[PDB]
């Protein structure tokens, strides 16, 4: 029969007060003969009724994709409230109940360190600027680079890695033309995480 997948909000929508975080309940393998999908939403066991249904999408594999979205409050999600989506469909012998929430565990503040390029790299065309983000929990995070107030696109960030002390760490590598680094421009590692003061911190880096 049809299957249900309940997704958390984007970490950026939960930590940035200008954005709106939403929990998404995706129902796949919806049949054409019984496309009706009843949605029951519960926040900490209490049913809520402010969820909207996304437009039905034909998947061109003989099934429908039916999606419900519930806006959540920022502090509600960050305070670890549980959101239950109950999906009902005539192709289901019994309703499917899924429940998600923020990763449990005490949030730990990330330590952000900028590491300059190695002296052995200055023989290449482009050098590597390193940002070490360690000791953070939960794993949800976002890392970006910028120079003189302008965003820097040419960078890659490793996924979070579980450390030996139960926290997470990652690395972000910004690649710049060696001339830029030797020019002396300041580069900034911008890290977003719930356990940071105001969910944000910057660490500069220059020669």
């Amino acid at each position: 029969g049809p299957s249900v997948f309940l997704f958390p909000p984007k970490p950026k929508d939960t930590l940035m007060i200008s954005r709106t975080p939403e929990v998404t309940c995706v129902v796949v393998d919806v049949s054409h003969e019984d496309p009706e999908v009843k949605f029951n939403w519960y926040v900490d066991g209490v049913e809520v009724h402010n969820a909207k249904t996304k437009p039905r999408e034909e998947q061109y594999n003989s099934t429908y994709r039916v999606v419900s979205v519930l806006t959540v409050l920022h502090q509600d999600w960050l305070n670890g409230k549980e959101y239950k989506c109950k999906v009902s469909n005539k192709a289901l012998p019994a309703p499917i109940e899924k429940t998600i929430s923020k990763a449990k565990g005490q949030p730990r503040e990330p330590q952000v360190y900028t590491l300059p390029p190695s002296r052995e790299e200055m023989t290449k065309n482009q050098v590597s600027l390193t940002c070490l983000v360690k000791g953070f929990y939960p794993s949800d995070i976002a890392v970006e680079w910028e120079s003189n107030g302008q965003p820097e696109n040419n960078y890659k960030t490793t996924p979070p890695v579980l450390d030996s002390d139960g926290s997470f760490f990652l690395y972000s590598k910004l690649t710049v033309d060696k001339s830029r680094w030797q020019q002396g421009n300041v580069f900034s590692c911008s890290v977003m995480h719930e356990a940071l003061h105001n969910h944000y911190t910057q660490k500069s880096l220059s020669l």
Binding site: L15, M16, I17, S18, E144, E146, P151, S190, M192, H197, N198, H199, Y200
Partner: peptide, 13 residues
Amino acid sequence: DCAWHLGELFWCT
């Protein structure tokens, strides 16, 4: 107090 990133209001204490 408040933090700002690229001009977007992040958060305020």
